[PDB]
Symmetry: D2
Subunit: 208 residues, 4 copies
């Protein structure tokens, strides 16, 4: 309607979400020794939509073809991340996990490429000391690869942060703590997921 109107039941209404803060996560981990933790990349620690938007309009303006196009991946994984914007929620989590002496892992469904400069983009943006840093893991279901879940088990990752359903379920399938970050509403990756759909923790205000 031209003027929908509203009411205070609607204005006050809350979805039943396990919201958490970075400070609550850290509190929850008080006294637990160094452990391995992992992050999804896209919309979790980098707003990488700039590179993906430019891939779609350079390589398949009318489809999602570009995501199976090696010319795109080679560009996305080798410097288009200089236009990716780091998420503040990720700065906060990564600083806290570095303070703990945790090992930091990035596990991505992006297609693998001959070389990648994503690892260095991350370590540089987030100031991750050498001793906490690990090369990006390209996970998936192509011949020769292992799944996200396998890599979590392989690396003994106890906490996995991610914005997509499959990040949470990959963690749950191996008994890790899967924590949800909100995808930004200006991402080009749509529809936005239903954060909290599995009763998982969701980080407040983690869209930026």
């Amino acid at each position: 309607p031209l003027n929908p109107g509203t009411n205070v039941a609607r204005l006050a209404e809350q979805a039943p979400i396990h919201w958490v803060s970075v400070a609550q996560i850290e509190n929850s981990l008080a006294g637990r020794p160094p452990m391995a933790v992992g992050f999804d990349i896209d919309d979790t620690v980098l707003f990488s939509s700039p590179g993906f938007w430019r891939g779609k309009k350079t390589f398949s303006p009318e489809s999602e073809d570009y995501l199976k196009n090696p010319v795109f991946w080679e560009k996305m994984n080798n410097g288009w991340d200089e236009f990716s914007i780091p998420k503040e929620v990720a700065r906060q989590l990564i600083d806290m996990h570095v303070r703990r002496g945790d090992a930091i892992f990035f596990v991505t469904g992006r297609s693998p490429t001959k070389t990648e400069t994503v690892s260095k983009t991350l370590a540089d943006n987030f100031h991750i000391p050498a001793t906490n840093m690990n090369p990006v893991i390209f996970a998936g279901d192509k011949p020769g690869q292992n799944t996200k879940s396998q890599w979590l088990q392989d690396k003994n990752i106890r906490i996995f942060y991610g914005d997509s359903d499959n990040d949470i379920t990959a963690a749950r399938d191996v008994g890790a703590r899967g924590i949800r970050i909100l995808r930004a509403s200006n991402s080009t990756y749509k529809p936005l997921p239903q954060a909290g759909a599995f009763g998982e923790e969701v980080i407040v205000n983690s869209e930026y």
Copy 2:
């Protein structure tokens, strides 16, 4: 779903409402001389649901019969308002209109009764000086009565505050400024109206 989840498009989403504050209304009236203004009663200046809830379960537990039952009205209009809770938004508006030297009118669709102590309940709760106070007007469509709209025109009411659609349209039909107040979500008068449905001003936080 057991865990609906949410996303930040939904968390940030706004209905396109002309929200206003009491301070903005007063600013809008800067330098305008004394004028007559009017208020709906129920859910506008009094949360009167306590009396109406007790009327429904005393007089028609299974219907809305009680609203045509004179035994109810006689009770509702003659002291059940001692359990009605005054709305803070109404305290703020009434104080400001008294400060302006405006005349205060209450125009109600409640059924008329032989006597009424509602006028005194209002003047007492809201501290309305004699010189600003006017006896409650019972408006409607029974033989001998005038409509809300007629009484607005008759009294030269230039601004009419109310929570129901018909308060806004009654004002609009006579060219008055109809300003919406939010019905509380715990009112027994349901469904809640769509505040802002006619592009009218709606007062922020006016549910209490």
Copy 3:
């Protein structure tokens, strides 16, 4: 404060970190647990009883809170003024759920004891609680700085306690029960509103009505 404060999208999306839950989530979390005792605070938890408290304030101590230790007030509040008290939908939903479960249902209130009380009847009637689930209201008092609820929750072996005030949640916590918060409506006369979620407790969504 400023005439046109404006706002921004960080503020509009911002969420406090609260363990929000729904009645269905609570019911699921209890699936397969046999009958147990559970407990509810009354005022702003199951009944919007502000009508009677407001009337009492205005009748007996217009300029203060003395009415709340005035016996003549309590006698009115506990023997008919809850006829103006509006049942909360969250309470109807939770009480139906616990009856489904076969749980014993207690009401534990800091209202002062009176010679008679028709509050037990009002609650049983309003919420259609069967006799086997219903228990007489327990009137525990205030008494600063004691929580007069805790000992009742221990005595009745209450495993879940719903309430809108901080002391409802801490009473539960004192006894190892699961304290679950209901939001106090903004038009309550009991002010200021508590910070639901301030102990990391579950808070029921939309529970202000």
Copy 4:
């Protein structure tokens, strides 16, 4: 700040007093008005151009804002880096609406002028603006404490100016145009976010994407 801040229903329902509007409301408010000139700011109004600005910061002045008066930066920003700029849906909706109307569409930007610019092409392409509605981007500068937009809006007889920054709204107000606010996304690198609505101006709902 506290580990479990909690919250309450006054806070959860609370609204700032903003003149929110929708594109449909704006279109209705213009029904029967003949073609006119209208204008848009670019950055965070029609394009999320933070990718290029972020890259520019990091390339040319990592520890400061000096890149924004560095010509080598502007030359990159205006000649290809908007290939990474993400069009805003609010902008697509508004620009389609103004084209429907037959309005002339201007882009007025405080980005610094460069020798060449492919920003006009990017916008025309991205938003499918026909040649008759499209106008070359107007690169006005910053220059504190001057608003370098106002004179352009007067020169082009722009009657509506959309923008996310306070100076977009005041430029409009300076010329008697109708200034309409778009929300800046919270993941913009241009911080802090402005207080949309702080001049009593219309603010477009959901306009952060």
